[PDB]
Assembly symmetry: C2
Homo-oligomer: 118 residues x 2
Protein backbone atom coordinates (compact mmCIF):
# COMPACT_ATOMS: atom_id res chain seq x y z
CA UNK A 1 0.00 0.00 0.00
CA UNK A 2 0.95 3.65 0.19
CA UNK A 3 1.09 6.73 2.31
CA UNK A 4 -1.86 9.04 1.92
CA UNK A 5 -1.58 12.43 0.12
CA UNK A 6 -2.74 15.20 2.42
CA UNK A 7 -3.82 18.15 0.26
CA UNK A 8 -3.37 20.38 3.34
CA UNK A 9 0.17 19.34 4.14
CA UNK A 10 2.65 22.21 4.18
CA UNK A 11 5.24 20.10 2.35
CA UNK A 12 5.62 19.95 -1.45
CA UNK A 13 5.55 16.57 -3.08
CA UNK A 14 8.59 15.63 -5.18
CA UNK A 15 8.34 13.38 -8.27
CA UNK A 16 11.47 11.95 -9.89
CA UNK A 17 12.02 9.76 -12.95
CA UNK A 18 15.10 8.37 -14.62
CA UNK A 19 14.21 7.70 -18.24
CA UNK A 20 16.66 5.51 -20.12
CA UNK A 21 17.99 7.03 -23.30
CA UNK A 22 17.27 4.19 -25.80
CA UNK A 23 20.67 3.74 -27.46
CA UNK A 24 19.90 0.11 -28.26
CA UNK A 25 16.91 1.12 -30.37
CA UNK A 26 18.87 3.88 -32.09
CA UNK A 27 22.56 2.94 -31.97
CA UNK A 28 23.84 5.86 -34.04
CA UNK A 29 21.44 8.63 -33.07
CA UNK A 30 23.12 11.38 -31.08
CA UNK A 31 20.63 11.93 -28.29
CA UNK A 32 22.97 13.85 -26.06
CA UNK A 33 23.66 16.45 -28.76
CA UNK A 34 20.01 16.72 -29.73
CA UNK A 35 18.77 17.11 -26.11
CA UNK A 36 21.46 19.47 -24.87
CA UNK A 37 21.64 21.38 -28.14
CA UNK A 38 24.32 23.94 -29.10
CA UNK A 39 25.77 25.36 -25.82
CA UNK A 40 23.03 23.43 -23.95
CA UNK A 41 20.25 25.79 -25.19
CA UNK A 42 17.75 23.08 -26.10
CA UNK A 43 17.78 21.65 -22.59
CA UNK A 44 17.68 25.10 -21.04
CA UNK A 45 14.55 25.98 -23.06
CA UNK A 46 13.12 22.59 -22.25
CA UNK A 47 13.42 23.23 -18.53
CA UNK A 48 11.84 26.70 -18.83
CA UNK A 49 8.91 25.42 -20.96
CA UNK A 50 8.21 22.41 -18.71
CA UNK A 51 8.94 23.89 -15.29
CA UNK A 52 10.91 20.76 -14.38
CA UNK A 53 14.54 20.14 -13.55
CA UNK A 54 15.93 17.98 -16.40
CA UNK A 55 19.46 16.55 -16.66
CA UNK A 56 21.31 14.14 -18.93
CA UNK A 57 23.32 11.67 -16.85
CA UNK A 58 25.33 8.45 -17.26
CA UNK A 59 28.11 7.34 -19.62
CA UNK A 60 28.14 9.67 -22.60
CA UNK A 61 26.35 12.54 -20.93
CA UNK A 62 29.29 14.91 -21.38
CA UNK A 63 30.20 14.20 -25.02
CA UNK A 64 33.93 14.47 -24.05
CA UNK A 65 34.96 10.77 -23.57
CA UNK A 66 38.26 12.02 -22.00
CA UNK A 67 36.80 14.51 -19.47
CA UNK A 68 34.38 11.74 -18.37
CA UNK A 69 37.28 9.26 -17.93
CA UNK A 70 39.20 11.78 -15.80
CA UNK A 71 36.23 12.76 -13.69
CA UNK A 72 35.15 9.19 -12.95
CA UNK A 73 38.78 8.22 -12.04
CA UNK A 74 39.13 11.13 -9.62
CA UNK A 75 36.52 9.37 -7.48
CA UNK A 76 34.61 12.55 -6.67
CA UNK A 77 31.03 11.47 -5.70
CA UNK A 78 29.24 14.22 -7.71
CA UNK A 79 30.35 12.35 -10.80
CA UNK A 80 29.21 8.96 -9.58
CA UNK A 81 26.50 8.95 -12.24
CA UNK A 82 29.07 8.60 -15.05
CA UNK A 83 28.88 4.83 -14.61
CA UNK A 84 25.14 4.62 -15.02
CA UNK A 85 23.30 3.89 -18.23
CA UNK A 86 22.69 7.03 -20.18
CA UNK A 87 19.38 8.53 -19.07
CA UNK A 88 17.34 11.65 -18.51
CA UNK A 89 16.54 12.54 -14.95
CA UNK A 90 13.38 14.53 -14.49
CA UNK A 91 12.64 16.18 -11.17
CA UNK A 92 9.58 18.26 -10.18
CA UNK A 93 8.13 19.45 -6.90
CA UNK A 94 4.84 21.11 -5.93
CA UNK A 95 1.44 20.41 -4.33
CA UNK A 96 0.11 17.18 -5.94
CA UNK A 97 -1.97 18.78 -8.66
CA UNK A 98 0.93 20.91 -9.85
CA UNK A 99 3.57 18.23 -9.37
CA UNK A 100 1.81 15.63 -11.53
CA UNK A 101 1.04 18.27 -14.13
CA UNK A 102 4.69 19.28 -14.39
CA UNK A 103 5.86 15.70 -14.47
CA UNK A 104 3.30 14.93 -17.20
CA UNK A 105 4.42 17.94 -19.27
CA UNK A 106 8.11 17.11 -18.88
CA UNK A 107 7.69 13.41 -19.48
CA UNK A 108 5.74 14.10 -22.71
CA UNK A 109 8.34 16.58 -23.97
CA UNK A 110 11.20 14.22 -23.14
CA UNK A 111 9.44 11.31 -24.92
CA UNK A 112 9.49 13.37 -28.10
CA UNK A 113 13.27 13.46 -27.90
CA UNK A 114 13.67 9.84 -26.96
CA UNK A 115 11.40 8.33 -29.53
CA UNK A 116 12.57 10.50 -32.40
CA UNK A 117 10.92 8.56 -35.22
CA UNK A 118 7.39 8.73 -33.82
Amino acid sequence: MENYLDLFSHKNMKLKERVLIPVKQYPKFNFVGKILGPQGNTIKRLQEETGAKISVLGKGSMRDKAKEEELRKGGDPKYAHLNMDLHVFIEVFGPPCEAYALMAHAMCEVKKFLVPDM
Copy 2:
Protein backbone atom coordinates in the same frame (compact mmCIF):
# COMPACT_ATOMS: atom_id res chain seq x y z
CA MET B 1 17.41 5.82 -6.00
CA GLU B 2 14.95 4.37 -8.46
CA ASN B 3 14.38 1.91 -11.22
CA TYR B 4 14.75 3.33 -14.69
CA LEU B 5 11.73 3.92 -17.01
CA ASP B 6 12.24 2.09 -20.27
CA LEU B 7 10.11 3.79 -22.92
CA PHE B 8 10.34 0.57 -24.98
CA SER B 9 9.14 -1.78 -22.27
CA HIS B 10 6.05 -3.77 -23.22
CA LYS B 11 4.55 -3.23 -19.76
CA ASN B 12 2.27 -0.32 -18.82
CA MET B 13 3.23 1.76 -15.85
CA LYS B 14 0.66 2.02 -13.05
CA LEU B 15 0.30 5.15 -10.86
CA LYS B 16 -1.79 5.08 -7.69
CA GLU B 17 -2.66 7.73 -5.11
CA ARG B 18 -4.77 7.71 -1.99
CA VAL B 19 -5.88 11.28 -1.37
CA LEU B 20 -7.27 11.95 2.09
CA ILE B 21 -10.72 13.48 2.11
CA PRO B 22 -10.13 16.52 4.42
CA VAL B 23 -12.94 16.12 6.95
CA LYS B 24 -10.94 17.96 9.60
CA GLN B 25 -10.80 21.08 7.44
CA TYR B 26 -14.49 20.82 6.57
CA PRO B 27 -16.22 18.92 9.38
CA LYS B 28 -19.77 19.28 8.06
CA PHE B 29 -19.22 19.20 4.31
CA ASN B 30 -20.65 16.09 2.70
CA PHE B 31 -17.83 15.06 0.42
CA VAL B 32 -19.08 11.57 -0.19
CA GLY B 33 -22.44 12.83 -1.49
CA LYS B 34 -20.84 15.53 -3.60
CA ILE B 35 -18.25 13.18 -5.19
CA LEU B 36 -20.52 10.21 -5.80
CA GLY B 37 -23.50 12.37 -6.72
CA PRO B 38 -27.10 11.14 -7.15
CA GLN B 39 -26.94 7.39 -8.01
CA GLY B 40 -23.13 7.76 -8.28
CA ASN B 41 -23.37 9.77 -11.55
CA THR B 42 -20.84 12.45 -10.61
CA ILE B 43 -18.12 9.89 -10.00
CA LYS B 44 -19.06 7.95 -13.10
CA ARG B 45 -18.71 11.10 -15.25
CA LEU B 46 -15.52 11.94 -13.43
CA GLN B 47 -13.97 8.62 -14.37
CA GLU B 48 -15.03 8.98 -18.03
CA GLU B 49 -13.70 12.57 -18.29
CA THR B 50 -10.37 11.76 -16.60
CA GLY B 51 -9.71 8.28 -17.95
CA ALA B 52 -8.73 7.14 -14.44
CA LYS B 53 -10.20 4.63 -12.03
CA ILE B 54 -11.50 6.65 -9.04
CA SER B 55 -13.08 5.25 -5.86
CA VAL B 56 -14.20 6.61 -2.50
CA LEU B 57 -12.95 4.36 0.30
CA GLY B 58 -12.69 4.29 4.11
CA LYS B 59 -15.16 4.94 6.95
CA GLY B 60 -18.11 6.85 5.54
CA SER B 61 -17.61 5.85 1.94
CA MET B 62 -20.98 4.11 1.74
CA ARG B 63 -23.21 6.73 3.41
CA ASP B 64 -25.15 3.86 5.13
CA LYS B 65 -23.52 3.70 8.63
CA ALA B 66 -25.38 0.37 9.22
CA LYS B 67 -24.40 -1.43 5.98
CA GLU B 68 -20.76 -0.42 6.69
CA GLU B 69 -20.99 -1.82 10.26
CA GLU B 70 -22.35 -5.13 8.95
CA LEU B 71 -19.85 -5.45 6.15
CA ARG B 72 -16.82 -4.69 8.32
CA LYS B 73 -18.05 -7.19 11.00
CA GLY B 74 -18.50 -9.97 8.44
CA GLY B 75 -14.71 -9.92 8.07
CA ASP B 76 -14.78 -10.22 4.28
CA PRO B 77 -11.41 -8.84 3.00
CA LYS B 78 -12.91 -6.83 0.08
CA TYR B 79 -14.33 -4.51 2.72
CA ALA B 80 -11.09 -4.16 4.64
CA HIS B 81 -10.88 -0.53 3.55
CA LEU B 82 -13.88 0.44 5.73
CA ASN B 83 -11.47 0.99 8.62
CA MET B 84 -9.24 3.40 6.75
CA ASP B 85 -9.50 7.16 6.83
CA LEU B 86 -11.90 8.40 4.25
CA HIS B 87 -10.03 8.98 1.00
CA VAL B 88 -10.13 8.95 -2.77
CA PHE B 89 -8.11 6.31 -4.52
CA ILE B 90 -6.96 7.23 -7.98
CA GLU B 91 -5.53 4.57 -10.27
CA VAL B 92 -4.19 4.98 -13.82
CA PHE B 93 -2.09 2.84 -16.13
CA GLY B 94 -0.39 3.48 -19.48
CA PRO B 95 3.01 4.18 -21.08
CA PRO B 96 4.70 6.90 -18.95
CA CYS B 97 3.60 9.90 -20.97
CA GLU B 98 -0.04 8.84 -20.89
CA ALA B 99 0.04 7.58 -17.30
CA TYR B 100 1.34 10.86 -15.83
CA ALA B 101 -1.07 12.82 -17.99
CA LEU B 102 -4.05 10.83 -16.72
CA MET B 103 -2.88 11.04 -13.15
CA ALA B 104 -2.40 14.80 -13.52
CA HIS B 105 -5.89 15.23 -15.00
CA ALA B 106 -7.52 13.09 -12.32
CA MET B 107 -5.59 14.60 -9.46
CA CYS B 108 -6.56 18.14 -10.59
CA GLU B 109 -10.24 17.21 -10.95
CA VAL B 110 -10.28 15.50 -7.56
CA LYS B 111 -8.60 18.52 -5.90
CA LYS B 112 -11.53 20.64 -7.04
CA PHE B 113 -13.83 18.41 -5.02
CA LEU B 114 -11.60 18.20 -2.00
CA VAL B 115 -10.79 21.84 -1.65
CA PRO B 116 -14.31 23.07 -2.29
CA ASP B 117 -13.81 26.67 -1.19
CA MET B 118 -10.91 27.42 -3.53
